[PDB]
Design a protein around this ligand. Structure first.
Ligand SMILES: Nc1ncnc2c1ncn2[C@@H]1O[C@H](COP(=O)(O)OP(=O)(O)OP(=O)(O)O)[C@@H](O)[C@H]1O
Ligand SMILES: [Ca+2]
Length: 358
C-alpha cells in the first residue's frame, strides 16, 4: 500500500507518493468559490476568478480556513493524485510553531472527513533536514508565506529556539511589483502579478556585498537583464535584480523592523545549547523556493561568518532540489521501515481522539 505525502504550502501544495523522488502534483494553494447569487482549486480557480471568490486557506504557513482546506485536500486526493484517501496512509506537513489545536483539527479532518487508515503530521523544516541526509542542523526554510529558522538536534526541532520572519516569496514579488510600477510599468492585478513573480524567479539574485553591487550597477550595464512582457514591451532591470531579495537581509526595505535572515539564523543558534552550536554552524541547510536566488548561500556564509566566533567552521548546504526538500523529506521518512510504527492509526484515533497526534 502506497503512502501519500502532502506539503501544505502558503503558495503551493506539493503532493505525491512516498518513495518517489519528487511530488507528482504541485499547484497553487487557492480555492475558488462561486460568487453568491461548483468550486475550483489551483490554476483553474485562478483562470475562472471572474466568476469565483478566491480563498487562501494557508496564511503564513498556518491553515486558517478548514472548509477551504478540505477542498484543497479533496482536490489533491481525487483530481491530482487520483487515489481514494481511505486506502492510503497520509503524511501531512505543518509549519513550525503550529498550534496544538491546529494539528488536532488536521487529524480530525483526515480521519473523519477522508477516512484515511493512518496519518502523521511532520514539521516542514525537519523534513527538509532529513532530505539533506542529516538529523542535526539548522534549517532556513523560506517559502511563499513565511520564513523560519529551525534548529534541530538528534532528529527533533528545538521549539524554544525557532525564529520566524514574517516575510517570504509573496512579499518579495510584491516589492518587485512596487519597484517596477514606480518605474512606469503598472503591475497591480493578478495577471500582472504572475509576470512579476516570473521576472523575480528568472532574473533576481542575492548580492555578495550590497553596497558594492549598487556601485557596479550605477557605473556599468554589466548587471542588466531584459525581459519581454506579454504586451511585447521589453523591460530592462539592473539593481532591481538584487534589491528585491536584499529584503531578506534588510526587511526595512519593505518597512519591517525585523532582523534579516542572517541575524535570525544567528539568534536561533544562540538560543540553543552552547554544546550543539558548533554542529549547527556547520550544518545550515537552506530549503524552500525563496532560497533559490543565485548567490544566497555565499551571502549567508559571509554574514554568518561575520557574526560567529572567528574560529567557527561554517557551512551552508543549499541542495539543488530545495524547492521540494520538505516534500522529499516526507517521502523519505514515510518510506522508512522504522516509521511504520509511528503512523497514527484510525483505530488509535477511534479510541483516543485527535489528542493522540502529539
Ligand atoms: N527560482 C526562484 N527564485 C526566487 N524565488 C522563487 C524561485 N522559485 C520559486 N520561488 C518562490 O518560492 C515561493 C514558493 O516556494 P515554496 O513552494 O517553498 O513555498 P510554500 O511552501 O508554498 O510556502 P510556505 O512554506 O511559506 O507556506 C514563491 O514565492 C515563488 O515565487
Ligand atoms: Ca513550504
Amino acid at each position: 500500500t502506497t503512502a501519500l505525502v502532502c506539503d501544505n504550502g502558503s503558495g503551493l501544495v506539493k503532493a505525491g507518493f512516498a518513495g518517489d523522488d519528487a511530488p507528482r502534483a504541485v499547484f497553487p494553494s487557492i480555492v475558488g468559490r462561486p460568487r453568491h447569487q461548483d468550486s475550483y482549486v489551483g490554476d483553474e480557480a485562478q483562470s475562472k476568478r471572474g466568476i469565483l471568490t478566491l480563498k487562501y486557506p494557508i496564511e503564513h504557513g498556518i491553515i486558517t480556513n478548514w472548509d477551504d482546506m478540505e477542498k484543497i485536500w479533496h482536490h489533491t486526493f481525487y483530481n491530482e493524485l487520483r487515489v481514494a484517501p481511505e486506502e492510503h496512509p497520509t503524511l501531512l506537513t505543518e509549519a513550525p510553531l503550529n498550534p496544538k489545536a491546529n494539528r488536532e483539527k488536521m487529524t480530525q479532518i483526515m480521519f473523519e472527513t477522508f477516512n484515511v487508515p493512518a496519518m502523521y503530521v511532520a514539521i516542514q523544516a525537519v523534513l527538509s533536514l532529513y532530505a539533506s541526509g542529516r538529523t542535526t542542523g539548522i534549517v532556513l526554510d523560506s517559502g511563499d508565506g513565511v520564513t523560519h529558522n529551525v534548529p534541530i538536534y538528534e532528529g527533533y526541532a528545538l521549539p524554544h529556539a525557532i525564529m520566524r520572519l514574517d516575510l517570504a516569496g509573496r512579499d518579495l514579488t510584491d516589492y518587485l511589483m512596487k519597484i517596477l510600477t514606480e518605474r512606469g510599468y503598472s503591475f497591480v492585478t493578478t495577471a500582472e502579478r504572475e509576470i512579476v513573480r516570473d521576472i523575480k524567479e528568472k532574473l533576481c539574485y542575492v548580492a555578495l556585498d550590497f553596497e558594492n553591487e549598487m556601485a557596479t550597477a550605477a557605473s556599468s550595464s554589466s548587471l542588466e537583464k531584459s525581459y519581454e512582457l506579454p504586451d511585447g514591451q521589453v523591460i530592462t532591470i539592473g539593481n532591481e535584480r538584487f534589491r528585491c531579495p536584499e529584503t531578506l537581509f534588510q526587511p526595512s526595505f519593505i518597512g519591517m523592523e525585523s532582523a534579516g535572515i542572517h541575524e535570525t539564523t544567528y539568534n536561533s543558534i544562540m538560543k540553543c545549547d552552547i554544546d550543539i552550536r558548533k554542529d549547527l554552524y556547520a550544518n545550515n541547510v537552506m530549503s524552500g523556493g525563496t532560497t533559490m536566488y543565485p548567490g544566497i548561500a555565499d551571502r549567508m556564509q559571509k554574514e554568518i561568518t561575520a557574526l560567529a566566533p572567528s574560529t567557527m567552521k561554517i557551512k551552508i548546504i543549499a541542495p539543488p532540489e530545495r524547492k521540494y526538500s520538505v516534500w522529499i523529506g516526507g517521502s523519505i521518512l514515510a518510506s522508512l521501515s522504522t516509521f511504520q510504527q509511528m503512523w497514527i492509526t484510525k483505530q488509535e484515533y477511534d479510541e483516543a481522539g485527535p489528542s493522540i497526534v502529539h
